[PDB]
Write a sequence for this structure.
């Protein structure tokens, strides 16, 4: 089993397993379902106005509570100082 | 009281012999019969052959 | 003893093996059903694991030329998320009390 | 005060009371970063003023992001390499077509016509070389294509090699695979494809010699020697390598290959003259190293073995012509003067290319010490006047020298 | 350069203050080694 | 991640790095902040036109 | 600007305290201003949530330097302490 | 070419500040204008709200290229780079991926479909086999209470559901993963644990109130 | 063959071989005394293609000895305390 998609032109040998090809699932008509609603239909409404500017970072829980706002901010600052996914740094000024 | 010099005043130095002998001139050379390298007569190599029989 | 220092170091790094990425982390929906004693127990577990992971990351940063990037870096993020979820649960209970 | 521009990059006189600037030692000019600042960019890591932010994103993208490959992908990358036999067949077909479509040079009267450049041939020959493990000289290829008979020989040999490889496979690949399998867990004769390959490589080397590139000729003969496993072919290749090394002034290798071709005498066919040519090359290498008695002994043994082959006879006559004059001048060649005089133009060209010049490339400009360049002062092999090693002192350990005035 | 030196090609004059500033700087370097300071070049920018 | 995705063929749905569009300026705004509600703005966007 | 842009070896901590520090501290301690402040006794006792959590769920990042105890029998290891 | 440059240069000419620098190089300062422009031109998804909303392109949809190279060609979405607003379509925009040579592996060249821009691609109606305008709609499942978002074509009215995304090829180590039957153990008694906490809080508050009464 | 050795002389004179060797080098290399240092001999971080440079690795003998510094130059409080 090869965990990645084969490149263009490769021929997988027998026995080698390949991740499945993407395909659309089942398909139904619109007149068969009875409750159909458009997403974000109301444009003239006034309740959808942002309470924070569009360039503010989202520091909040999934439910909306701010119990760990400062902890999330500290985690983001620590990740900016040194991310865990940081690969091999190329600059001539390395920490060690 | 000096003023800017035109390109023709600059090239007058080339007409002289002091400019040509310093820049535009070649070397008379030959191949060292021992080292097979280009060589000018009068100067030699650091080599026990080229120091005894200096070609 | 040396057994207390062997837990600061990853065993897979000592055996020159690939450290696998764990399954997940302690979510709030699961931590809500734990008592305070079990919460602080798993908190100290996460603390020891985080100490080991920080030691590994420091070692790789010290030797970044010889050793490449630290393998499986998502463990630090998982530990941080688990500790934050524990703190969330403890804060909720403290506010109720 | 302020007889020019106001920016620090301007070129005229300024003053501090009117145009105060911070200390900027060396910074790039208005056009681009010059080499005087790129030196710092590569050694110190930043420009020598410290005000410039090191922005190496482009070289990071060029090196690290490119050379990064995930392990799970590189585990399977090696499992999809092209088939070596099919690659060799395709490369041989393309190279043969590109050589066949090469136009015939028209011979003009009164002047030498310029040969058509090998533009569409460098890539097919590159694939052929990288698939067969043997490098071909482009000068030799051009000369073989210019020569009408050598071009026909090369075409015939390449066609034979193509047919043999397409009908039976690659015998060198089979040999390497069988050797690797035997090492994991004998030697056959030179096959037809290997014979055609060494034949075309010998043709390429002959064309390269006709051109005048003895180093490349000897290199082609050397990498062709690795494909012959027959005593006759090995003796012929050794004689050819000896001649090429004689022309290239490689006396050691010439002597070695000559004596190898001579040693291949008992197991060779009696019709071959490769052993005679090896004796000739050995004696010629001796004479070039100025061992006249050694060359005479070698050519005498060669004559006694082969009773007077024409090449051996001519070489013996030349050695006798030199011997009829050497005692008339010095009774021998001095020991401290052997292999000292240049005789060939190949070593003259080599000295022109890699000699010590007036001012640079000498022992006074820069010295090499373990793949690093040093000034003339820091020369670990020399403690002449002006070197830093004359200022070491006793290092507070013990009085090493009896010198009173210095050290 | 024999013809040039004969025909005076180049500045017939020369610097005069250097044969004394050189020994002054050497004495200063001695003083710096005494005071345990690193030796610096006399002319870093006046060159 | 660009290189690894190019080599593997997988899909990415969230950014691999958290981007602070304020460059640390949102930490200067107090935590209880929220924009006011503006009535009768000067904009044709709330009409929902789809052909001009 | 009051922000310190120097990240060298002589970086100085700013003794001057601002309003935002107090605001963030209150909001992190007792959810200011959405929650009423706890009484002074709870705020100054060991049962206040910050001190309670710092005691029962300690957060100290003590990591071992491997270059001291890796393939060498040493009597004095080295740790990186907060 | 650094060694060649330094060899062609003369030994008399000296260059200073080789290991140190007059100005402190640890004060943060902005780049050059062209470098900032390079950054802005390369990393455009760093801008706020760069991701297209609503997202309609999911792997498995048949889409045609409407502009650029390979125009009028159909394909199937293989991958989705959602934050860059890019699509990887099948056998479309195939380019050679040069892999550098390592110590034990030679340099290889492989082909791979490169990410294409989302704006220059349009879906294909599965019933009509033609370009259609697709909009996001919300429908409640007949057997599931949740209301999921599907993609309806405005031309024919065909509902196209969104496929899930999950990869279980990687698994955790049993030495550091607690099992689910041990993690989901409900061992929290709210009535017993809240009592001691309330008692401690109340004791502290009463103690401080008594001290205030004392000083008053 | 019996050349002068600093360690042998210090063992003969009972003069603390470390201190004896420090007697023949600048004081700022072995003690906490004001002395200037070249920027090249100070360590530099690692670069792509080269390991890190450490001053302690490139000059192990030119390291300050805190023990000798305290026992020779710094004053002890045990002789000063008077309770
Ligand atoms: Mg300074
Ligand atoms: Zn010579």
């Amino acid at each position: 089993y090869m965990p990645f998609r084969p490149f263009h032109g490769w021929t997988v040998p027998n026995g080698v397993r390949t991740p499945p090809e993407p395909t659309l699932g089942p398909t139904a008509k619109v007149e068969d379902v009875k409750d159909v609603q458009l997403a974000e239909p109301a444009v003239g409404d006034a309740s959808h106005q942002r309470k924070l500017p569009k360039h503010f970072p989202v520091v909040q829980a999934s439910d909306g509570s701010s119990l760990l706002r400062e902890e999330t901010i500290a985690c983001m600052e620590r990740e900016r100082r040194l991310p865990h996914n940081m690969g091999k740094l190329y600059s001539y000024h390395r920490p060690y | 009281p000096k003023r800017k010099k035109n390109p023709m005043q600059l090239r007058r130095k080339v007409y002289g012999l002091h400019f040509k002998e310093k820049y535009l001139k070649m070397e008379e050379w030959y191949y060292c019969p021992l080292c097979a390298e280009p060589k000018k007569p009068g100067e030699w190599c650091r080599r026990e052959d080229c120091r005894q029989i200096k070609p | 003893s040396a057994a207390a220092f062997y837990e600061f170091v990853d065993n897979n790094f000592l055996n020159n093996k690939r450290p696998p990425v764990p399954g997940g982390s302690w979510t709030v929906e699961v931590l809500r059903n734990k008592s305070l004693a079990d919460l602080q127990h798993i908190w100290f577990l996460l603390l020891k694991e985080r100490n080991m992971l920080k030691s590994m990351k420091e070692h790789y940063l010290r030797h970044q030329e010889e050793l490449g990037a630290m393998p499986a870096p998502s463990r630090l993020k998982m530990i941080d998320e688990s500790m934050r979820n524990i703190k969330r649960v403890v804060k909720e209970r403290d506010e109720e009390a | 005060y302020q007889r020019g521009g106001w920016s620090p990059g301007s070129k005229h006189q300024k003053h501090m009371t009117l145009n105060p600037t911070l200390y900027l030692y060396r910074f790039p000019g208005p056009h681009g970063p010059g080499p005087y600042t790129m030196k710092y960019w590569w050694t110190l890591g930043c420009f020598p003023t410290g005000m410039e932010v090191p922005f190496r994103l482009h070289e990071f993208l060029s090196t690290y992001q490119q050379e990064h490959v995930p392990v799970e992908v590189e585990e399977w990358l090696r499992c999809y390499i092209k088939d070596p036999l099919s690659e060799l067949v395709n490369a041989s077909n393309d190279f043969f077509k590109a050589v066949e479509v090469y136009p015939e040079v028209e011979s003009a009267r009164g002047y030498k016509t310029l040969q058509p450049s090998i533009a569409p041939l460098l890539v097919p020959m590159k694939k052929f070389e990288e698939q067969l493990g043997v490098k071909i000289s482009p000068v030799g290829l051009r000369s073989v294509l210019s020569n009408p008979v050598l071009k026909d020989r090369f075409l015939d040999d390449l066609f034979d090699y193509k047919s043999y490889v397409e009908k039976g496979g690659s015998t060198p690949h089979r040999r390497l695979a069988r050797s690797r399998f035997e090492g994991s867990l004998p030697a056959e004769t030179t096959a037809d494809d290997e014979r055609s390959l060494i034949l075309l490589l010998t043709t390429i080397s002959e064309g390269c010699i006709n051109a005048g590139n003895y180093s490349d000729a000897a290199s082609v003969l050397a990498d062709a020697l690795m494909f012959c496993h027959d005593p006759d072919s090995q003796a012929t290749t050794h004689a050819n390598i000896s001649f090429a090394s004689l022309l290239n002034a490689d006396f050691k290798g010439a002597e070695y290959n000559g004596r190898e071709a001579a040693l291949l005498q008992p197991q060779v066919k009696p019709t071959s003259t490769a052993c005679a040519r090896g004796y000739v090359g050995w004696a010629a290498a001796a004479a070039y190293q100025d061992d006249f008695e050694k060359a005479e002994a070698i050519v005498k043994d060669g004559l006694t073995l082969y009773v007077g082959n024409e090449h051996l006879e001519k070489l013996a006559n030349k050695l006798q012509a030199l011997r009829e004059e050497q005692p008339s001048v010095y009774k021998q060649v001095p020991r401290s003067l052997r292999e000292s005089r240049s005789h060939l133009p190949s070593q003259q060209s080599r000295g022109l290319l890699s000699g010590s010049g007036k001012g640079f490339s000498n022992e006074f400009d820069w010295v090499e010490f373990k793949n690093k360049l040093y000034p003339s002062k820091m020369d670990p092999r020399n403690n002449e006047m002006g070197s830093v090693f004359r200022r070491v002192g006793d290092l507070g350990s013990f009085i090493s020298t009896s010198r009173s005035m210095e050290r | 350069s024999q013809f040039l030196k004969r025909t005076f090609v180049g500045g017939m004059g020369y610097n005069v203050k250097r044969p004394y500033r050189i020994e002054i700087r050497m004495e200063h370097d001695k003083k710096r080694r005494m005071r345990r300071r690193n030796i610096g070049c006399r002319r870093m920018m006046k060159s | 991640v660009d290189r690894e995705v190019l080599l593997t063929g997988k899909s990415v749905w969230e950014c691999p790095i958290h981007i602070d569009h304020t460059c640390g300026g949102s930490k200067t705004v107090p935590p209880h902040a929220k924009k006011p509600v503006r009535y009768m703005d000067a904009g044709i966007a709330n009409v929902g036109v789809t052909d001009i | 600007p009051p922000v310190n842009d120097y990240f060298g070896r002589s970086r100085i901590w700013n003794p001057i305290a601002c309003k935002l520090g107090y605001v963030r501290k209150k909001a992190d301690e007792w959810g200011w201003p959405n929650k009423p402040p706890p009484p002074t006794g709870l705020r100054y006792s060991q049962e206040f949530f910050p001190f309670f959590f710092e005691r029962y769920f300690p957060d100290a990042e003590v990591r071992l330097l491997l270059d001291s105890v890796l393939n060498n029998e040493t009597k004095r290891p080295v740790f990186q302490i907060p | 070419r650094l060694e060649l440059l330094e060899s062609m240069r003369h030994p008399r000419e000296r260059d200073f500040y080789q290991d140190h620098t007059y100005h402190n190089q640890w004060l943060r300062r902005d780049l050059e204008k062209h470098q900032k422009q390079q950054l802005a031109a390369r990393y455009k998804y760093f801008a706020p709200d760069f991701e297209i909303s609503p997202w309609i392109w999911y792997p498995g949809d048949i889409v045609e290229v409407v502009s650029g190279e390979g125009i009028g060609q159909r394909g199937t979405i293989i991958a989705v780079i959602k934050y860059k607003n890019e699509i990887v379509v099948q056998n479309i925009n195939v380019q050679d991926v040069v892999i550098p040579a390592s110590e034990s592996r030679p340099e290889q060249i492989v082909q791979r479909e490169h990410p294409i821009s989302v704006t220059r691609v349009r879906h294909v109606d599965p019933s009509t086999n033609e370009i259609c305008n697709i909009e996001m709609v919300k429908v409640r499942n007949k057997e599931t209470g949740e209301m999921e978002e599907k993609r309806m074509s405005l031309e024919s009215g065909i509902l196209m559901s969104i496929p899930p995304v999950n990869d279980e090829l990687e698994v955790g180590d049993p030495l550091k993963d607690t099992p689910i039957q041990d993690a989901d153990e409900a061992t929290y008694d709210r009535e017993a644990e809240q009592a001691v906490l309330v008692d401690k809080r109340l004791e502290a508050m009463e103690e401080h109130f008594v001290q205030s009464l004392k000083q008053s | 063959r019996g050349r002068f050795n600093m360690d042998e002389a210090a063992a003969a004179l009972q003069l603390n071989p470390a201190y004896a060797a420090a007697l023949y080098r600048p004081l700022n290399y072995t003690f906490h005394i004001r002395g200037q240092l070249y920027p090249a001999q100070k360590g530099r971080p690692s670069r792509p293609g080269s390991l890190a440079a450490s001053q302690g690795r490139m000059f192990p003998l030119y390291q300050r000895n805190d023990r000798l510094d305290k026992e020779l130059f710094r004053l002890n409080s045990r002789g000063l305390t008077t309770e």
In short: Residues 42 and 48 of chain G are 6 Å apart (CA to CA). The interface with chain F takes residues 20, 23-24, 27, 32-34 of chain G (CB under 8 Å).
